[PDB]
PDB file of C-alpha atoms and ligand atoms in Angstrom:
ATOM      1  CA  UNK A   5       7.581   5.198  17.075  1.00 46.85           C
ATOM      2  CA  UNK A   6       6.902   1.228  15.814  1.00 45.31           C
ATOM      3  CA  UNK A   7       8.278   0.539  12.332  1.00 48.09           C
ATOM      4  CA  UNK A   8       6.104  -0.423   9.718  1.00 49.56           C
ATOM      5  CA  UNK A   9       7.422  -3.915   9.534  1.00 48.41           C
ATOM      6  CA  UNK A  10       6.391  -4.720  12.784  1.00 48.74           C
ATOM      7  CA  UNK A  11       2.827  -4.740  11.430  1.00 48.75           C
ATOM      8  CA  UNK A  12       2.529  -7.228   8.601  1.00 49.94           C
ATOM      9  CA  UNK A  13      -0.662  -5.830   7.685  1.00 47.17           C
ATOM     10  CA  UNK A  14      -0.377  -2.488   7.923  1.00 43.70           C
ATOM     11  CA  UNK A  15       3.218  -3.065   5.929  1.00 45.23           C
ATOM     12  CA  UNK A  16       1.254  -4.835   2.957  1.00 43.30           C
ATOM     13  CA  UNK A  17      -1.330  -2.385   2.448  1.00 42.44           C
ATOM     14  CA  UNK A  18       1.656   0.437   2.529  1.00 43.68           C
ATOM     15  CA  UNK A  19       3.164  -1.794   0.261  1.00 42.25           C
ATOM     16  CA  UNK A  20       0.601  -2.198  -2.209  1.00 43.67           C
ATOM     17  CA  UNK A  21      -0.074   1.452  -2.006  1.00 43.62           C
ATOM     18  CA  UNK A  22       3.545   2.178  -3.181  1.00 43.45           C
ATOM     19  CA  UNK A  23       3.078   0.226  -6.317  1.00 45.36           C
ATOM     20  CA  UNK A  24       0.031   1.767  -7.347  1.00 45.67           C
ATOM     21  CA  UNK A  25       1.365   4.657  -7.057  1.00 50.36           C
ATOM     22  CA  UNK A  26       4.229   4.215  -8.700  1.00 53.71           C
ATOM     23  CA  UNK A  27       6.566   3.366 -12.082  1.00 51.93           C
ATOM     24  CA  UNK A  28       8.135   0.345  -9.917  1.00 50.33           C
ATOM     25  CA  UNK A  29       7.266  -2.396 -11.781  1.00 53.36           C
ATOM     26  CA  UNK A  30       7.016  -0.937 -15.200  1.00 57.35           C
ATOM     27  CA  UNK A  31      10.417   0.217 -14.408  1.00 54.73           C
ATOM     28  CA  UNK A  32      11.572  -3.381 -13.952  1.00 55.31           C
ATOM     29  CA  UNK A  33       9.531  -4.889 -16.464  1.00 56.97           C
ATOM     30  CA  UNK A  34      11.216  -2.384 -19.008  1.00 57.05           C
ATOM     31  CA  UNK A  35      14.708  -3.847 -18.070  1.00 54.40           C
ATOM     32  CA  UNK A  36      13.595  -7.244 -18.259  1.00 53.30           C
ATOM     33  CA  UNK A  37      12.683  -6.222 -21.879  1.00 55.31           C
ATOM     34  CA  UNK A  38      15.108  -3.916 -23.556  1.00 56.71           C
ATOM     35  CA  UNK A  39      18.205  -5.574 -21.620  1.00 59.31           C
ATOM     36  CA  UNK A  40      17.789  -8.614 -19.986  1.00 57.25           C
ATOM     37  CA  UNK A  41      17.966 -10.367 -23.599  1.00 58.57           C
ATOM     38  CA  UNK A  42      21.712  -9.463 -24.019  1.00 57.81           C
ATOM     39  CA  UNK A  43      22.929 -10.484 -20.449  1.00 58.72           C
ATOM     40  CA  UNK A  44      21.495 -13.957 -20.609  1.00 57.73           C
ATOM     41  CA  UNK A  45      22.252 -14.423 -24.008  1.00 56.19           C
ATOM     42  CA  UNK A  46      24.804 -16.713 -23.553  1.00 56.05           C
ATOM     43  CA  UNK A  47      24.167 -18.563 -20.139  1.00 56.17           C
ATOM     44  CA  UNK A  48      22.505 -21.505 -21.778  1.00 56.26           C
ATOM     45  CA  UNK A  49      25.620 -22.029 -24.381  1.00 55.18           C
ATOM     46  CA  UNK A  50      26.369 -25.963 -24.127  1.00 54.01           C
ATOM     47  CA  UNK A  51      24.387 -26.845 -21.243  1.00 53.66           C
ATOM     48  CA  UNK A  52      21.361 -29.124 -21.545  1.00 53.82           C
ATOM     49  CA  UNK A  53      19.447 -27.843 -18.626  1.00 55.64           C
ATOM     50  CA  UNK A  54      19.841 -23.987 -17.533  1.00 55.36           C
ATOM     51  CA  UNK A  55      19.654 -23.852 -12.890  1.00 55.56           C
ATOM     52  CA  UNK A  56      18.221 -20.530 -12.119  1.00 55.68           C
ATOM     53  CA  UNK A  57      18.574 -19.451  -8.183  1.00 56.53           C
ATOM     54  CA  UNK A  58      15.870 -16.526  -7.252  1.00 55.42           C
ATOM     55  CA  UNK A  59      17.013 -15.549  -3.708  1.00 57.16           C
ATOM     56  CA  UNK A  60      13.359 -13.785  -2.739  1.00 55.44           C
ATOM     57  CA  UNK A  61      10.003 -15.075  -3.465  1.00 53.25           C
ATOM     58  CA  UNK A  62       8.630 -11.708  -3.614  1.00 54.63           C
ATOM     59  CA  UNK A  63       8.895 -10.746  -7.284  1.00 52.45           C
ATOM     60  CA  UNK A  64       7.034 -13.748  -8.201  1.00 53.01           C
ATOM     61  CA  UNK A  65       5.936 -11.983 -11.623  1.00 50.89           C
ATOM     62  CA  UNK A  66       9.538 -10.653 -12.527  1.00 47.54           C
ATOM     63  CA  UNK A  67      10.698 -14.041 -11.729  1.00 48.83           C
ATOM     64  CA  UNK A  68       8.273 -15.360 -14.518  1.00 51.20           C
ATOM     65  CA  UNK A  69       9.067 -12.873 -17.090  1.00 53.34           C
ATOM     66  CA  UNK A  70      12.904 -13.857 -16.398  1.00 54.57           C
ATOM     67  CA  UNK A  71      12.085 -17.236 -17.448  1.00 55.01           C
ATOM     68  CA  UNK A  72      10.215 -16.267 -20.551  1.00 54.14           C
ATOM     69  CA  UNK A  73      13.431 -13.974 -21.726  1.00 54.48           C
ATOM     70  CA  UNK A  74      15.335 -17.289 -20.959  1.00 55.14           C
ATOM     71  CA  UNK A  75      13.158 -19.342 -23.081  1.00 55.01           C
ATOM     72  CA  UNK A  76      13.322 -17.703 -25.991  1.00 57.51           C
ATOM     73  CA  UNK A  77      16.555 -17.783 -26.297  1.00 55.32           C
ATOM     74  CA  UNK A  78      16.962 -21.438 -25.313  1.00 55.03           C
ATOM     75  CA  UNK A  79      13.723 -22.923 -26.794  1.00 53.64           C
ATOM     76  CA  UNK A  80      13.439 -27.007 -25.977  1.00 53.28           C
ATOM     77  CA  UNK A  81      15.898 -26.475 -22.697  1.00 51.67           C
ATOM     78  CA  UNK A  82      14.661 -27.687 -19.674  1.00 54.33           C
ATOM     79  CA  UNK A  83      14.828 -24.742 -16.919  1.00 56.63           C
ATOM     80  CA  UNK A  84      15.401 -25.406 -13.237  1.00 56.84           C
ATOM     81  CA  UNK A  85      13.998 -22.539 -11.111  1.00 59.99           C
ATOM     82  CA  UNK A  86      14.900 -22.626  -7.327  1.00 59.61           C
ATOM     83  CA  UNK A  87      13.371 -19.791  -4.584  1.00 61.98           C
ATOM     84  CA  UNK A  88      14.557 -19.297  -1.569  1.00 63.58           C
ATOM     85  CA  UNK A  89      12.120 -17.295   0.466  1.00 62.75           C
ATOM     86  CA  UNK A  90      11.919 -17.331   4.281  1.00 62.28           C
ATOM     87  CA  UNK A  91       8.090 -16.647   4.088  1.00 60.30           C
ATOM     88  CA  UNK A  92       5.402 -19.269   3.824  1.00 59.28           C
ATOM     89  CA  UNK A  93       2.754 -16.755   2.681  1.00 58.90           C
ATOM     90  CA  UNK A  94       5.128 -15.486   0.069  1.00 57.43           C
ATOM     91  CA  UNK A  95       6.056 -18.823  -1.520  1.00 58.09           C
ATOM     92  CA  UNK A  96       2.166 -19.976  -1.033  1.00 57.26           C
ATOM     93  CA  UNK A  97       1.328 -16.630  -3.459  1.00 54.85           C
ATOM     94  CA  UNK A  98       3.942 -17.671  -5.803  1.00 50.20           C
ATOM     95  CA  UNK A  99       2.804 -21.260  -6.278  1.00 50.18           C
ATOM     96  CA  UNK A 100      -1.082 -19.889  -6.992  1.00 48.19           C
ATOM     97  CA  UNK A 101       0.867 -17.695  -9.634  1.00 46.53           C
ATOM     98  CA  UNK A 102       2.519 -20.831 -11.233  1.00 45.01           C
ATOM     99  CA  UNK A 103      -0.214 -23.169 -11.212  1.00 42.94           C
ATOM    100  CA  UNK A 104      -2.141 -20.136 -13.065  1.00 40.92           C
ATOM    101  CA  UNK A 105      -0.177 -19.760 -16.299  1.00 38.81           C
ATOM    102  CA  UNK A 106      -0.896 -22.294 -19.124  1.00 40.40           C
ATOM    103  CA  UNK A 107       2.890 -22.883 -21.266  1.00 38.82           C
ATOM    104  CA  UNK A 108       5.820 -23.877 -18.917  1.00 34.28           C
ATOM    105  CA  UNK A 109       6.763 -27.363 -19.406  1.00 35.39           C
ATOM    106  CA  UNK A 110      10.216 -26.966 -19.666  1.00 34.06           C
ATOM    107  CA  UNK A 111      10.609 -25.583 -16.631  1.00 32.79           C
ATOM    108  CA  UNK A 112      10.740 -27.750 -12.997  1.00 33.32           C
ATOM    109  CA  UNK A 113      10.177 -25.042  -9.837  1.00 34.55           C
ATOM    110  CA  UNK A 114      11.264 -25.698  -6.294  1.00 34.47           C
ATOM    111  CA  UNK A 115      10.678 -23.771  -3.217  1.00 33.63           C
ATOM    112  CA  UNK A 116      12.895 -23.523   0.020  1.00 34.90           C
ATOM    113  CA  UNK A 117      11.648 -21.700   2.892  1.00 33.41           C
ATOM    114  CA  UNK A 118      14.538 -19.952   4.470  1.00 32.62           C
ATOM    115  CA  UNK A 119      16.830 -17.194   4.602  1.00 29.67           C
ATOM    116  CA  UNK A 120      19.656 -16.539   1.822  1.00 32.10           C
ATOM    117  CA  UNK A 121      21.623 -16.984   5.268  1.00 32.20           C
ATOM    118  CA  UNK A 122      20.594 -19.897   6.162  1.00 31.00           C
ATOM    119  CA  UNK A 123      20.370 -21.423   2.806  1.00 28.30           C
ATOM    120  CA  UNK A 124      23.906 -20.711   2.378  1.00 28.34           C
ATOM    121  CA  UNK A 125      24.984 -22.121   5.408  1.00 27.95           C
ATOM    122  CA  UNK A 126      23.131 -25.235   4.666  1.00 31.57           C
ATOM    123  CA  UNK A 127      24.795 -25.444   1.712  1.00 30.17           C
ATOM    124  CA  UNK A 128      28.241 -25.272   3.021  1.00 29.53           C
ATOM    125  CA  UNK A 129      27.434 -27.981   4.941  1.00 31.32           C
ATOM    126  CA  UNK A 130      26.903 -30.505   2.110  1.00 28.06           C
ATOM    127  CA  UNK A 131      30.183 -31.574   0.820  1.00 25.29           C
ATOM    128  CA  UNK A 132      29.985 -30.730  -2.786  1.00 24.87           C
ATOM    129  CA  UNK A 133      29.137 -27.269  -4.268  1.00 25.54           C
ATOM    130  CA  UNK A 134      26.667 -27.244  -7.151  1.00 22.86           C
ATOM    131  CA  UNK A 135      26.544 -24.205  -9.538  1.00 22.15           C
ATOM    132  CA  UNK A 136      24.399 -21.876 -11.032  1.00 21.93           C
ATOM    133  CA  UNK A 137      23.660 -20.214 -14.276  1.00 24.68           C
ATOM    134  CA  UNK A 138      21.950 -17.304 -13.458  1.00 26.63           C
ATOM    135  CA  UNK A 139      21.119 -15.620  -9.914  1.00 26.48           C
ATOM    136  CA  UNK A 140      19.207 -12.771  -9.321  1.00 22.42           C
ATOM    137  CA  UNK A 141      18.547 -10.980  -5.789  1.00 20.38           C
ATOM    138  CA  UNK A 142      15.838  -8.283  -6.606  1.00 20.54           C
ATOM    139  CA  UNK A 143      15.459  -5.970  -3.952  1.00 18.23           C
ATOM    140  CA  UNK A 144      16.107  -7.966  -0.996  1.00 17.73           C
ATOM    141  CA  UNK A 145      19.647  -6.884   0.526  1.00 20.95           C
ATOM    142  CA  UNK A 146      17.911  -4.451   2.464  1.00 21.07           C
ATOM    143  CA  UNK A 147      17.205  -7.897   4.742  1.00 22.28           C
ATOM    144  CA  UNK A 148      20.343  -9.508   4.581  1.00 22.29           C
ATOM    145  CA  UNK A 149      22.786  -9.485   7.583  1.00 21.90           C
ATOM    146  CA  UNK A 150      26.230  -9.761   6.175  1.00 22.18           C
ATOM    147  CA  UNK A 151      25.864  -8.301   2.408  1.00 20.91           C
ATOM    148  CA  UNK A 152      29.812  -8.490   1.626  1.00 18.79           C
ATOM    149  CA  UNK A 153      29.896 -12.198   2.415  1.00 19.00           C
ATOM    150  CA  UNK A 154      26.772 -12.968   0.833  1.00 16.73           C
ATOM    151  CA  UNK A 155      27.813 -11.249  -2.322  1.00 15.86           C
ATOM    152  CA  UNK A 156      31.115 -13.812  -2.385  1.00 14.56           C
ATOM    153  CA  UNK A 157      28.957 -16.482  -1.338  1.00 16.25           C
ATOM    154  CA  UNK A 158      26.340 -16.501  -4.292  1.00 16.04           C
ATOM    155  CA  UNK A 159      29.320 -15.067  -6.605  1.00 18.17           C
ATOM    156  CA  UNK A 160      31.325 -18.421  -6.072  1.00 19.62           C
ATOM    157  CA  UNK A 161      28.310 -20.458  -7.156  1.00 19.23           C
ATOM    158  CA  UNK A 162      28.556 -18.856 -10.617  1.00 17.52           C
ATOM    159  CA  UNK A 163      28.777 -21.678 -13.266  1.00 22.22           C
ATOM    160  CA  UNK A 164      30.831 -20.895 -16.678  1.00 25.30           C
ATOM    161  CA  UNK A 165      29.374 -18.036 -18.621  1.00 25.73           C
ATOM    162  CA  UNK A 166      26.999 -17.245 -15.762  1.00 28.35           C
ATOM    163  CA  UNK A 167      25.830 -13.906 -14.038  1.00 29.87           C
ATOM    164  CA  UNK A 168      24.307 -13.268 -10.573  1.00 31.95           C
ATOM    165  CA  UNK A 169      21.867  -9.509 -11.130  1.00 31.94           C
ATOM    166  CA  UNK A 170      20.965  -7.520  -8.162  1.00 30.46           C
ATOM    167  CA  UNK A 171      18.598  -4.657  -8.158  1.00 31.13           C
ATOM    168  CA  UNK A 172      18.519  -1.928  -5.343  1.00 32.26           C
ATOM    169  CA  UNK A 173      17.309   1.393  -5.121  1.00 31.48           C
ATOM    170  CA  UNK A 174      20.093   3.782  -6.986  1.00 32.99           C
ATOM    171  CA  UNK A 175      22.466   6.001  -5.138  1.00 31.32           C
ATOM    172  CA  UNK A 176      20.883   9.059  -6.509  1.00 31.98           C
ATOM    173  CA  UNK A 177      17.527   8.655  -5.749  1.00 32.54           C
ATOM    174  CA  UNK A 178      14.606  10.218  -3.052  1.00 37.37           C
ATOM    175  CA  UNK A 179      15.922   7.152  -0.705  1.00 37.98           C
ATOM    176  CA  UNK A 180      19.668   8.200  -0.291  1.00 38.18           C
ATOM    177  CA  UNK A 181      19.001  11.565   0.622  1.00 38.93           C
ATOM    178  CA  UNK A 182      15.319  10.975   2.939  1.00 39.83           C
ATOM    179  CA  UNK A 183      17.859   8.379   4.544  1.00 39.64           C
ATOM    180  CA  UNK A 184      20.959   9.952   4.468  1.00 38.12           C
ATOM    181  CA  UNK A 185      19.140  13.169   6.658  1.00 39.23           C
ATOM    182  CA  UNK A 186      16.611  11.782   8.560  1.00 38.97           C
ATOM    183  CA  UNK A 187      17.260   7.993   8.523  1.00 38.65           C
ATOM    184  CA  UNK A 188      19.051   8.149  12.061  1.00 37.07           C
ATOM    185  CA  UNK A 189      15.602   9.906  13.324  1.00 37.93           C
ATOM    186  CA  UNK A 190      13.602   6.950  12.120  1.00 38.60           C
ATOM    187  CA  UNK A 191      12.601   3.523  13.838  1.00 38.98           C
ATOM    188  CA  UNK A 192      16.011   1.403  13.159  1.00 40.63           C
ATOM    189  CA  UNK A 193      14.995  -2.117  12.575  1.00 45.00           C
ATOM    190  CA  UNK A 194      17.331  -4.898  13.334  1.00 46.63           C
ATOM    191  CA  UNK A 195      16.431  -6.622  10.313  1.00 48.24           C
ATOM    192  CA  UNK A 196      16.429  -3.894   7.971  1.00 48.22           C
ATOM    193  CA  UNK A 197      19.212  -1.791   6.440  1.00 47.63           C
ATOM    194  CA  UNK A 198      19.436   1.338   4.456  1.00 50.29           C
ATOM    195  CA  UNK A 199      21.416   0.398   1.491  1.00 47.82           C
ATOM    196  CA  UNK A 200      21.942   1.870  -2.236  1.00 50.03           C
ATOM    197  CA  UNK A 201      24.000   1.385  -5.139  1.00 48.82           C
ATOM    198  CA  UNK A 202      27.076   3.072  -4.095  1.00 49.96           C
ATOM    199  CA  UNK A 203      27.085   1.389  -0.618  1.00 48.16           C
ATOM    200  CA  UNK A 204      27.097  -2.323  -3.367  1.00 47.55           C
ATOM    201  CA  UNK A 205      29.611  -0.909  -5.930  1.00 46.73           C
ATOM    202  CA  UNK A 206      32.271   0.084  -2.872  1.00 47.30           C
ATOM    203  CA  UNK A 207      31.799  -3.366  -1.631  1.00 46.36           C
ATOM    204  CA  UNK A 208      32.337  -5.232  -5.086  1.00 46.52           C
ATOM    205  CA  UNK A 209      34.932  -2.731  -5.670  1.00 45.40           C
ATOM    206  CA  UNK A 210      36.885  -4.044  -2.469  1.00 47.86           C
ATOM    207  CA  UNK A 211      35.722  -7.246  -3.073  1.00 47.00           C
ATOM    208  CA  UNK A 212      37.250  -7.419  -6.520  1.00 46.06           C
ATOM    209  CA  UNK A 213      34.558  -8.763  -8.361  1.00 49.28           C
ATOM    210  CA  UNK A 214      33.316  -7.304 -11.906  1.00 52.42           C
ATOM    211  CA  UNK A 215      30.421  -5.892 -12.816  1.00 53.92           C
ATOM    212  CA  UNK A 216      28.456  -3.337 -14.282  1.00 51.25           C
ATOM    213  CA  UNK A 217      25.576  -0.615 -13.251  1.00 49.60           C
ATOM    214  CA  UNK A 218      22.318   0.735 -15.034  1.00 48.11           C
ATOM    215  CA  UNK A 219      19.789   2.930 -13.773  1.00 46.86           C
ATOM    216  CA  UNK A 220      16.293   3.775 -14.989  1.00 47.01           C
ATOM    217  CA  UNK A 221      14.350   6.308 -13.640  1.00 45.68           C
ATOM    218  CA  UNK A 222      11.389   5.066 -11.740  1.00 44.11           C
ATOM    219  CA  UNK A 223       8.956   7.723  -9.726  1.00 43.07           C
ATOM    220  CA  UNK A 224       6.715   7.208  -7.086  1.00 41.33           C
ATOM    221  CA  UNK A 225       3.335   9.915  -7.149  1.00 45.73           C
ATOM    222  CA  UNK A 226       3.120  10.837  -3.755  1.00 43.96           C
ATOM    223  CA  UNK A 227       0.610  13.670  -3.986  1.00 38.73           C
ATOM    224  CA  UNK A 228      -1.877  12.714  -1.634  1.00 42.47           C
ATOM    225  CA  UNK A 229       0.893  12.546   1.267  1.00 39.47           C
ATOM    226  CA  UNK A 230       0.209  16.722   1.206  1.00 40.61           C
ATOM    227  CA  UNK A 231      -3.691  16.355   1.684  1.00 38.86           C
ATOM    228  CA  UNK A 232      -3.359  16.082   5.491  1.00 41.02           C
ATOM    229  CA  UNK A 233      -6.023  13.265   6.295  1.00 45.81           C
ATOM    230  CA  UNK A 234      -5.924  11.817   3.394  1.00 46.12           C
ATOM    231  CA  UNK A 235      -6.317   7.919   3.527  1.00 48.49           C
ATOM    232  CA  UNK A 236      -3.913   6.939   0.618  1.00 49.72           C
ATOM    233  CA  UNK A 237      -1.665  10.247   1.449  1.00 52.98           C
ATOM    234  CA  UNK A 238      -0.838   8.727   4.737  1.00 52.09           C
ATOM    235  CA  UNK A 239      -0.604   5.052   3.660  1.00 48.46           C
ATOM    236  CA  UNK A 240       2.198   6.312   1.856  1.00 46.22           C
ATOM    237  CA  UNK A 241       4.155   8.320   4.369  1.00 48.04           C
ATOM    238  CA  UNK A 242       4.091   5.061   6.579  1.00 49.83           C
ATOM    239  CA  UNK A 243       6.034   3.455   3.450  1.00 53.03           C
ATOM    240  CA  UNK A 244       8.036   6.436   2.999  1.00 52.25           C
ATOM    241  CA  UNK A 245       9.101   6.239   6.562  1.00 53.63           C
ATOM    242  CA  UNK A 246       8.504   2.612   6.945  1.00 54.26           C
ATOM    243  CA  UNK A 247       6.909   3.870  10.492  1.00 54.03           C
ATOM    244  CA  UNK A 248       3.555   2.631  11.783  1.00 52.55           C
ATOM    245  CA  UNK A 249       0.729   6.067  11.627  1.00 50.76           C
ATOM    246  CA  UNK A 250       3.429   8.107  11.116  1.00 51.51           C
ATOM    247  CA  UNK A 251       1.295  11.749  11.086  1.00 52.21           C
ATOM    248  CA  UNK A 252      -0.611  10.320  14.392  1.00 54.56           C
ATOM    249  CA  UNK A 253       2.597   8.825  15.688  1.00 49.80           C
ATOM    250  CA  UNK A 254       5.708  10.970  15.577  1.00 49.65           C
ATOM    251  CA  UNK A 255       6.664  14.567  16.029  1.00 50.08           C
ATOM    252  CA  UNK A 256       5.264  17.533  14.567  1.00 50.28           C
ATOM    253  CA  UNK A 257       8.497  19.389  14.379  1.00 51.83           C
ATOM    254  CA  UNK A 258       9.864  16.426  12.187  1.00 49.68           C
ATOM    255  CA  UNK A 259       6.842  15.675  10.028  1.00 45.17           C
ATOM    256  CA  UNK A 260       7.190  19.496   9.338  1.00 44.53           C
ATOM    257  CA  UNK A 261      10.938  19.297   7.982  1.00 42.88           C
ATOM    258  CA  UNK A 262      10.109  16.313   5.330  1.00 40.26           C
ATOM    259  CA  UNK A 263       6.566  18.598   4.124  1.00 39.41           C
ATOM    260  CA  UNK A 264       9.130  21.143   2.942  1.00 42.15           C
ATOM    261  CA  UNK A 265      11.875  18.439   1.922  1.00 43.79           C
ATOM    262  CA  UNK A 266      10.041  16.112  -0.184  1.00 42.37           C
ATOM    263  CA  UNK A 267       8.593  18.680  -2.161  1.00 39.61           C
ATOM    264  CA  UNK A 268      12.364  19.726  -2.475  1.00 36.74           C
ATOM    265  CA  UNK A 269      13.794  18.910  -5.942  1.00 36.08           C
ATOM    266  CA  UNK A 270      16.448  16.726  -4.827  1.00 38.69           C
ATOM    267  CA  UNK A 271      13.901  14.718  -3.086  1.00 36.49           C
ATOM    268  CA  UNK A 272      11.311  14.886  -5.983  1.00 38.66           C
ATOM    269  CA  UNK A 273      10.440  16.636  -9.539  1.00 35.66           C
ATOM    270  CA  UNK A 274       7.061  18.780  -9.515  1.00 37.99           C
ATOM    271  CA  UNK A 275       5.113  17.623 -12.843  1.00 38.05           C
ATOM    272  CA  UNK A 276       1.745  18.352 -14.397  1.00 39.89           C
ATOM    273  CA  UNK A 277      -0.710  17.991 -11.275  1.00 41.54           C
ATOM    274  CA  UNK A 278       1.586  15.377  -9.528  1.00 43.00           C
ATOM    275  CA  UNK A 279       4.870  15.601  -7.512  1.00 44.09           C
ATOM    276  CA  UNK A 280       6.831  12.664  -7.722  1.00 40.78           C
ATOM    277  CA  UNK A 281       9.475  11.294  -5.999  1.00 41.25           C
ATOM    278  CA  UNK A 282      12.907   9.989  -7.411  1.00 40.23           C
ATOM    279  CA  UNK A 283      12.415   6.237  -7.076  1.00 40.02           C
ATOM    280  CA  UNK A 284      15.239   5.526  -9.652  1.00 37.25           C
ATOM    281  CA  UNK A 285      16.420   1.515  -9.483  1.00 35.34           C
ATOM    282  CA  UNK A 286      20.038   0.230 -10.030  1.00 36.28           C
ATOM    283  CA  UNK A 287      20.826  -2.994 -12.013  1.00 32.60           C
ATOM    284  CA  UNK A 288      23.956  -4.490 -11.304  1.00 34.18           C
ATOM    285  CA  UNK A 289      25.342  -7.307 -13.069  1.00 33.09           C
ATOM    286  CA  UNK A 290      27.998  -9.724 -12.152  1.00 32.92           C
ATOM    287  CA  UNK A 291      30.433 -11.471 -14.292  1.00 33.72           C
ATOM    288  CA  UNK A 292      31.326 -15.221 -13.227  1.00 33.33           C
TER     289      UNK A 292
HETATM  290  N1  LIG B 301      11.591   0.686  -3.318  1.00 33.85           N
HETATM  291  C1  LIG B 301      11.672  -0.678  -2.704  1.00 33.85           C
HETATM  292  C2  LIG B 301      12.189  -0.066  -1.265  1.00 33.85           C
HETATM  293  C3  LIG B 301      12.365  -0.754  -0.163  1.00 33.85           C
HETATM  294  N2  LIG B 301      11.804  -2.140  -0.074  1.00 33.85           N
HETATM  295  C4  LIG B 301      10.964  -2.566  -1.128  1.00 33.85           C
HETATM  296  C5  LIG B 301      10.736  -4.308  -1.037  1.00 33.85           C
HETATM  297  C6  LIG B 301      10.120  -4.865  -2.689  1.00 33.85           C
HETATM  298  C7  LIG B 301      10.469  -4.066  -4.239  1.00 33.85           C
HETATM  299  C8  LIG B 301      10.221  -2.200  -3.557  1.00 33.85           C
HETATM  300  C9  LIG B 301      11.255  -1.442  -2.489  1.00 33.85           C
HETATM  301  C10 LIG B 301      12.416  -0.417   1.385  1.00 33.85           C
HETATM  302  C11 LIG B 301      13.338   0.817   1.688  1.00 33.85           C
HETATM  303  C12 LIG B 301      12.972   1.571   0.261  1.00 33.85           C
HETATM  304  C13 LIG B 301      12.738   1.431  -1.090  1.00 33.85           C
END
């Protein structure tokens, strides 16, 4: 069995089928409108420049929804938004999106093609240590080698009244149970790491940092996954298992239990017509 992360193309398509069959984006957007305003309420106070650091260029459109909310609280204030993203393809796509929006004059972007870790070292090199008013790591800790050291480092870049927002799947979600029971049976990638809000809150408690945790229900429609042969129904299998051609490349004994289990309640909820997997998300906000 070859992990899904080893076939950039298969990944993408599978990843797209994920968004297209789930409330993933709507959920984050619900957060940006009903909660962010309150959170980023004073990160601009007394400053003639607002510095935003996004560790991850995959959510270009969320990065933008963020600015929107920040620009609304501080009319006229110039905003410096830096992005740390390893993938040239991601930065590229991000740039297209930026150029296609009419109205952002109070914003200056800068991209850095590197990893949160490479960026960290490079900075620890320069004598001076810059500060930020708002930092956010949306769904990318999975890809971080040393979490505790990352959490501590970026927290230390927080200026006055600054805040760091982190988003990962909730510890009370399908993902959790799924990983806890079958993870040890999927292709364990050197680069990926199954992580939920529980791991995070333990890590932050030990680190001694002060935070607040918000969970919002989100669901993934996995019905196509029960009609054997289905084209889409399998794209999602590949995503849930992050494994290339799950069906046609894995132990029948295994696919059997999952079939039974994905329909289980602690994994999904059966609603009118559809079977929804628990995609509950966690929003962690850390005070400087
Ligand atoms: N919902 C997501 C999951 C993973 N990566 C993601 C990366 C982008 C934002 C949504 C994601 C990896 C494992 C499980 C879930």
